[PDB]
Amino acid sequence: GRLMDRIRKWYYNAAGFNKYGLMRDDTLYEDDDVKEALKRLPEDLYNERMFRIKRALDLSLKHRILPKEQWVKYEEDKPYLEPYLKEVIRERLEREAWNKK
């Protein structure tokens, strides 16, 4: 429903990672699927992500955040990793199911 979609944008703002300049995907815990997914990222997307994270960590150490202007906006958050992650998980399930078979 286009209602809970209001909820989403709410949560997104409540979470607050955008205040560090992080994209939703930059906050994913690096389990195994994510580890693999990242290895498949194009050089540029990978380095962009790297700087964003090193930037947040520097903010976090400083106990500061980004000026309101620079915060990532809900509709401008690039889910760059989700496509790859989605695939890494498909492949794994395939193998898993095939090995029980």
Partner 1 sequence: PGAEDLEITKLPNGLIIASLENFSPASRIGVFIKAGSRYETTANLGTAHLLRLASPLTTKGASSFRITRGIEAVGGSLSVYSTREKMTYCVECLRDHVDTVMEYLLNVTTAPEFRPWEVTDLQPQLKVDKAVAFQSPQVGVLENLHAAAYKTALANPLYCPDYRIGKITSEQLHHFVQNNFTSARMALVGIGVKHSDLKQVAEQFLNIRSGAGTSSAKATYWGGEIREQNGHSLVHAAVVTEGAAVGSAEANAFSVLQHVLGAGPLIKRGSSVTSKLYQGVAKATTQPFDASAFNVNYSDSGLFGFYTISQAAHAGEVIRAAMNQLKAAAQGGVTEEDVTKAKNQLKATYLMSVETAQGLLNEIGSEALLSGTHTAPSVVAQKIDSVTSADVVNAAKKFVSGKKSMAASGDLGSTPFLDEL
3-class secondary-structure state, position 79: coil
CA distance 96 to 12: 34
Please state, in angstroms and rounded to a whole number, the distance separating the CA atoms of residues 56 and 93: 34
Interacting residue with partner 1 among 17, 28, 40, 89 (CB under 8 A): 40
Q: How many CB atoms neighbour CB 38 within 10 A?
A: 19
Q: What is the largest CA-CA distance in the chain?
A: 55
Return the residue of 16, 42, 79, 83 that touches partner 1, per CB under 8 A. Answer: 42
Per CB under 8 A, the list member of 4, 5, 98, 100 interacting with partner 1 is 98
Among 8, 39, 73, 86, binds partner 1 (CB under 8 A): 39
Q: How far is the CB of 22 from partner 1 (least distance, A)?
A: 24
Residue 83 interacting with partner 1 (CB under 8 A): no
Residues lying near partner 1 in the complex (CB under 8 A) are found at 39-40, 42, 91, 94-95, 98
